[PDB]
Design brief:
This is part of a larger assembly, with one copy of chain A (51 residues), one copy of chain B (578 residues) and two copies of chain C. Chain A is mainly α. Chain A is 92% helix and 0% strand. Classes of the chains: A mainly alpha (51), B alpha+beta (578), C alpha/beta (468). The complex binds adenosine-5'-triphosphate and magnesium ion. Chain B: InterPro entries: ATP-synt_VA_C, ATP-synth_a_Xtn, ATP_synth_asu-like_sf, ATPase_a/bsu_AS, ATPase_F1/V1/A1_a/bsu_N, ATPase_F1/V1/A1_a/bsu_N_sf, ATPase_F1/V1/A1_a/bsu_nucl-bd, ATPase_F1/V1_b/a_C.
Chain lengths: 51, 578, 468, 471
């Protein structure tokens, strides 16, 4: 009974939590990459175009 | 007026030039086709316009004309029994003009200018009138439609049209300064309509559903949110509230949903019967439709138009219920518009001012004293459809900080077809305490005690279910087995409700009270029988369980006799047994 | 009509290129690009200004240079020529024939983006369709004018079920009382991102069945440009709308894999440097998918109809992925396959618990199918769900704690799976299916069968599983 | 001058910001008046300046403004508020204007709303113990006069009722410390950020019922009010509180309704300016901005006044790791955390004692202040409750029957502790009654395992039966 409970209930729940957390962290990294792109584009624009 | 030309096009965003003198949040006419647009930016000689219609085929150099006025609606007789576009255009006139497809550039009037209305004056020459006062009545479908002074108007009257039939655009009252007042007036949709006072809600908003009326009530003039994944039952619940609730006027807003869900309402509703007047159900309902494949930028306008109309019907003294089909689509529209502006976004790309808009929208609801002196109320029920199916998405979190009730749906209960699929463990309501004086005098004196007993039984069953899952139902003692069985009987017979059954779709308060009394009487008898030593199976094999299970299918007329018969049967069965 | 050329091209960067003085290019137009070697590419205009216009190319930009490249003009609205002689033909994702036959003669030219249908002009779907699959026909019934996708996993036989639905699709006019008279039926098949082996399988199945005469096929292989994948379903839906709402056909539309459509959509959006969404997909995916699914339905005063059966593959098995989640918010139900049933050999492996059909209530009842259809379906759902829960309890704890009633529920669940779901290649009617369902309900005590009436069983009682 | 200058060179309007290009004369941080073409006047604040152009944030909405007729006029260079002793009993909006229909206040002084830091030499240690009448606060998370003690709340949890009950029941005990004459009542300063009509009506009714409006000053900013006005409300409230406490020797209690809304407005302004974000969305300088609000409380050497703050904030997904609760817990002197699980069982007030904390507890307890056994009793209660929770987690896995006697005793102690100690309703408890109940609960355990209490206190107080108090 103990082996069946551990194999059925616990492990899939832990695995689902792991993959959910991984997806959230990946999303945050993608968003900060987009922000870095925008600020680099802003930096390079004001240094060259202005006279 | 201010006139200029176009030089930039990107999706629904049009940038005009030569617009020096245009004001923020005005309305512009765009291009040769004559589209509708709104200005939200100013920069030098240029203006940034979002377009409420399709922008395909536009070219650089087409003229832009500014009307100088913000987005406004026409409020007056003729809005009932009607179906409107996202910017208040009647859809059947568009069908008559264009056909079966909605093309852009169609110009229609919101109110019919050619219908005759019966006019009955109230004021006399020389009287002093103020904003929100009543001057004249017009007969509508069962209702009495009052003609109101616009809120920002003061003056003295010496001209009254006599009792006769006139159109909506004839001056019926002329003020001393020369202002002419007609049967209709316009109001900008972004400004809240003035009131005198706001009151505490103290009467229930009866929905006809047992679980919502008993466990998680919402008061007349409150707000509520109903989140849940796809297939949980938001639309069916909202349509049942539209059919069965005791509100005088129902305003339904479809914001980016299916067109079939609106065609069903259009077709089925005229055949039904109004609960409190007996006429057709469509005579009290106003529909605003903006389906998913219609232009994206028009979703915000539909929400504001709906809440403005609901505020207008409040000032006449009615009690109005507003249902928003989805606010997630409105959030997506805001995200798209901000993406065209290249603003820095918050979490998940939503603009940082997202919570302010939701706060301003839900704040329109309340029970007020109108300017004319009558008492009205507006209640708002808004469905949230989180694409990020977890309950931590920003729209849900920003919604939960202002709403008074929270009806949470569960996908697990929807899979096993346990509709309404309301999660009674995660849901809550903050209006329970204030409604108790009304419950004690209008239903029964012991009603809150029965409600508390039902909640206690549900909590105990919730604990014992985890015990059962970790151990098994055989190892339980007889008292725990009885609690589990009574909880299952409650969950199957009282909480569950079929919205497509002819009889089960509507339930009065006294029917729910009778069912609760029957369940608790059975529980008390079975509890006393365990002390006598009777087996648990002898209780479960009793034929009286079938009587409780079929009780929710009994009609309202036949119910009191059924209830009395069932009480006698319970007493006799538990007396004679063992 | 005379043509116009612009040679002022001074920017090339990935998929985009800028035109120096294209003041009269309408927004959303279609342009063709010619380089120094004479090769012609296509492109669509999505920008315009007083200083430049932005054109993204429908394919790679190799070989372009700023000295010799010129941009010409095609008509400013993406249009497709349609005619009744398209029946029996094959086309690629852009509309050119790939059967080698001469091109069609267009009756009319229509925009491929369509127009929104007026909700006043719609009418309620009311005609039930019998497909011969008992799980679909009894519990998740299909109505004309419905968009009902099939949720599949990787390695599950979705294409075979799609082909079986295409063959076995038929209406039952005798139940409605009108009597049997012919109706024009047709199939529009749109495959995107399809490999050569499955392409050969589809072509061979359609030629073997004999339905190629009444069908139109749009094909798009995996080596084609990514724009053709985007433009493929719009052209198929334009053809379907034309046929149904002009010539009063009853058309059935099948979309092979929407997962490839979403991946192609992600490739296009990411190249233009715009904000991402929940999983890398663009934030406007909901509206873009809604412009496709919402074209189905029926129209008041017109005899035609359009029915959609999309097929999509979930990433591993998961819901809450953006593709099936956003699909579930637009369509009117889902048919979800189960890997557990496929593993043990049950065909077709349809799982009834997550499957759903919202328009079932409109197409069933007295005078449509039977007087007991809805109540039978509800009782089957409740009994099966309880049997599944008790089976989980048995697997965790053991067989010791069971009463006789729970063993009855377990026997009901096993019998229901083995007999009801597994049908192989049968073509079961609605009435024999309801008889089988009533036979399954006879396993349970008559007291437990709430919310039904006993005249329904009073004339079809006592049957066992006669197929065995 | 005889007439003041006006600037018309405005070419930008987008969101809350507004650019003017001929305005080098405006000081940084100045307050300006924005005049509409129709005559309406809106306020704004300058946060950037150059010889080229200036950047102004607008408090009210931007509807109706145009680039041709709008003009900007100048008010004084520092945002200053006029304060007086006559303002007790008045109501004000988010920016300090009266909304009670009474004539405005004639100022005795005009003070800058941003304030100034307190000199660490000039401070002194908070000492006086405050009896709030709640056992889980009085015994285990003691509040002393001069403390910043925020309340961490959820969505449906009753933080407002707890705050009102604390404000109603709060008093000091001069008899225990021997300080002599009884105190004067607290003066309440109530600052509300974006708040619904329901909460506002409840607070107004509760203050009217007890007659506390004669001592109170209310700054109200409703949910339908402009968002950027929320920047100024806490600063004005704390300016008034500091003036009253340190110039007129009052004992001021300050309640801030929802710091979450203040953080939302701050994020709006930061995102409009393309600032570098913090963790989730909020700007990187949010720690410094919150610090200028909280750190204005305390006591001052040589003066009788005091300022006590009870901010209320809502953890969004009941999440303690969210940026707003994290920064609040880094700045403040403790926290009171409400529990949803206790709320679902009908327990009021639903204070969870384990995540709660009071940093300044050790200054206000001990002999000569409350009693000699306070700290040891608190420690023993904490350890016993932690053991009970751990044993709950154990019996969730192994089952009740496998327990020994010791674990069963701890489990029953945890259940009785929750039901009797935490659940108290609207009743008022003195410190002696709470200590008596706590000693009665500890008597359920043998003397062997309570090692954190000295043997003299055990010999004196142990052995009480709970049935005498609850039966
Ligand atoms: N109370 C109910 N009684 C009977 N059937 C119900 C009930 N609630 C839901 N259903 C069934 O479940 C389906 C759920 O569809 P519904 O439109 O209500 O879902 P939803 O959560 O609003 O989804 P969407 O996000 O797609 O709008 C209904 O079509 C119906 O078949
Ligand atoms: Mg729905």
């Amino acid at each position: 009974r103990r082996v069946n409970a551990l194999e059925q209930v616990v492990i899939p729940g832990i695995r689902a939590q792991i993959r959910f957390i991984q997806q959230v962290l990946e999303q945050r990294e993608r968003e900060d990459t987009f922000r870095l792109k925008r600020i680099k584009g802003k930096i390079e624009a004001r240094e060259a175009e202005e006279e | 007026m201010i006139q200029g030309v176009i030089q930039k096009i990107a999706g629904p965003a049009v940038i005009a030039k030569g617009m020096l003198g245009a004001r923020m949040y005005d309305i512009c006419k765009v291009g040769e086709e004559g589209l509708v647009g709104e200005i939200i930016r100013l920069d030098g000689d240029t203006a940034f316009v979002q377009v409420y219609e399709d922008t395909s085929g536009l070219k650089v150099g087409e003229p832009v004309v500014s009307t100088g006025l913000p987005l406004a609606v026409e409020l007056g007789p003729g809005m009932l029994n009607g179906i409107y576009d996202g910017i208040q255009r009647p859809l059947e006139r568009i069908r008559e003009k264009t056909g079966i497809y909605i093309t852009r550039g169609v110009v229609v009037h919101a109110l019919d200018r050619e219908k005759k209305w019966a006019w009955t004056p109230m004021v006399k020459p020389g009287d002093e009138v103020r904003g929100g006062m009543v001057l004249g009545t017009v007969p509508e479908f069962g209702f009495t439609h009052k003609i109101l002074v616009p809120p920002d108007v003061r003056g003295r009257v010496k001209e009254v049209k006599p009792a006769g039939e006139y159109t909506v655009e004839e001056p019926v009252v002329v003020l001393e300064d020369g202002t002419e007042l007609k049967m209709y007036h316009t109001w900008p949709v972004r400004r809240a309509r003035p009131v005198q006072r706001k009151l505490d809600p103290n009467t229930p908003f009866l929905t006809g559903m047992r679980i919502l009326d008993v466990l998680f009530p919402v008061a007349m003039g409150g707000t509520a949110a109903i989140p849940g994944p796809f297939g949980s039952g938001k639309t069916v619940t909202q349509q049942s509230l539209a059919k069965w609730s005791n509100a005088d006027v129902v305003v339904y807003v479809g914001c980016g949903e299916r067109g079939n869900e609106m065609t069903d309402v259009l077709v089925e509703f005229p055949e039904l019967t109004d609960p409190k007047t007996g006429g057709p159900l469509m005579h009290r309902t106003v529909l605003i439709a903006n389906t998913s494949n219609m232009p994206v930028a028009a979703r915000e306008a539909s929400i504001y138009v709906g809440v403005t109309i609901a505020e207008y019907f409040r000032d006449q003294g009615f009690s109005v219920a507003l249902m928003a089909d989805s606010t997630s689509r409105w959030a997506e529209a805001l995200r798209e518009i901000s993406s065209r502006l290249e603003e820095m976004p918050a979490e998940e790309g939503y603009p940082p001012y997202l919570a302010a808009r939701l706060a301003a929208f839900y704040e329109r609801a309340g029970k007020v004293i109108t300017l004319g002196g009558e008492e009205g109320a507006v209640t708002i029920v808004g469905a949230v459809s989180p694409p990020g199916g977890d309950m931590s998405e920003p729209v849900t979190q920003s919604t939960l900080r202002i709403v008074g009730a929270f009806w949470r749906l569960d996908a697990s209960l929807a899979f096993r077809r346990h509709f309404p699929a309301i999660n009674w463990n995660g849901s809550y309501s903050l209006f329970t305490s204030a409604l108790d004086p009304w419950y004690r005098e209008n239903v029964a004196e012991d009603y809150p005690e029965l409600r508390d007993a039902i909640s206690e039984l549900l909590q105990r069953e919730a604990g014992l279910q985890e015990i059962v899952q970790l151990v098994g139902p055989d190892a339980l003692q007889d008292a725990e087995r009885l609690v589990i069985e009574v909880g299952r009987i409650i969950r199957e017979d009282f909480l569950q409700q079929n919205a497509y059954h002819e009889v089960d779709a509507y339930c009065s308060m006294k029917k729910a009270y009778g069912i609760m009394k029957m369940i608790l009487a059975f529980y008390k008898e079975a509890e006393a029988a365990i002390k006598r030593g009777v087996s648990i199976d002898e209780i479960l094999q009793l034929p009286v369980l079938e009587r409780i299970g079929r009780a929710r299918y009994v009609s309202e007329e036949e119910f009191p006799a059924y209830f009395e018969e069932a009480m006698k049967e319970i007493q006799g069965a538990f007396k004679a047994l063992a | 009509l005379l043509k116009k050329e612009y040679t002022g091209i001074t920017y090339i960067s990935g998929p985009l290129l800028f035109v120096e003085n294209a003041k009269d290019l309408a927004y959303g137009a279609i342009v063709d690009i010619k380089d120094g070697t004479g090769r012609v590419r296509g492109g669509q205009v999505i920008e315009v200004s007083e200083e430049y216009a932005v054109i993204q190319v429908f394919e790679e930009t190799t070989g372009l240079d700023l000295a010799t490249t010129s941009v010409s003009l095609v008509e400013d609205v993406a249009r497709l020529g349609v005619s009744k002689e398209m029946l029996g033909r094959r086309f690629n994702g852009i509309g050119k024939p790939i059967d080698g036959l001469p091109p069609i003669t267009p009756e009319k030219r229509l925009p491929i983006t369509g127009l929104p249908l007026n909700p006043v002009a719609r009418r309620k779907p009311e005609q039930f369709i019998q497909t011969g699959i008992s799980t679909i026909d009894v519990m998740n019934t299909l109505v004309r004018g419905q968009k009902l996708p099939i949720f599949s996993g990787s390695g599950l036989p979705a294409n075979e079920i799609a082909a079986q639905i295409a063959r076995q699709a038929t209406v039952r006019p005798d139940l409605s009382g009108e009597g049997e008279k012919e109706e024009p039926f047709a199939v529009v098949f749109a495959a995107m991102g399809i490999t050569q082996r499955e392409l050969s399988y589809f072509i061979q199945e359609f030629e073997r069945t004999g339905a190629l005469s009444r069908s139109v096929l749009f094909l798009n292989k995996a080596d084609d440009p990514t724009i053709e994948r985007i433009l493929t379903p719009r052209m198929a839906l334009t053809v379907a709308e034309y046929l149904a709402f002009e010539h009063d056909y009853h058309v059935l539309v099948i979309l092979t894999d929407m997962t490839n459509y979403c991946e192609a959509l992600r490739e296009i959006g990411a190249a233009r440097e715009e904000i991402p969404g929940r999983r890398g997909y663009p934030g406007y995916m909901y509206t873009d998918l809604a412009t496709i699914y919402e074209r189905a339905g029926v129209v008041e005063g017109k005899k035609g109809s359009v029915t959609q059966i999309p097929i999509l593959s979930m990433p591993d098995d998961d819901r809450t992925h953006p593709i099936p989640d956003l699909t579930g918010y637009i369509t009117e139900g889902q048919i979800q396959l189960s890997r557990e049933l496929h593993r043990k050999g049950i065909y077709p492996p349809i799982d009834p618990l997550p499957s759903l059909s919202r328009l079932m209530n409109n197409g069933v009842g007295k005078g449509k199918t039977r007087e007991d259809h809805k109540q039978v379906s509800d009782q089957l759902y409740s009994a099966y769900a309880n049997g599944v829960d008790i089976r989980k309890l048995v697997a965790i704890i053991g067989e010791d704690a069971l009463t006789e009633n729970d063993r009855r529920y377990l026997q009901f669940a096993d019998a229901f799976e083995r007999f009801f779901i597994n049908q192989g290649q049968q073509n079961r009617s609605i009435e024999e299916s309801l008889q089988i369902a009533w036979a399954l309900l006879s396993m349970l005590p008559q007291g437990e069968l709430k919310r039904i009436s006993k005249d329904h069983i009073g004339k079809y009682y006592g049957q066992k599983l006669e197929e065995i």
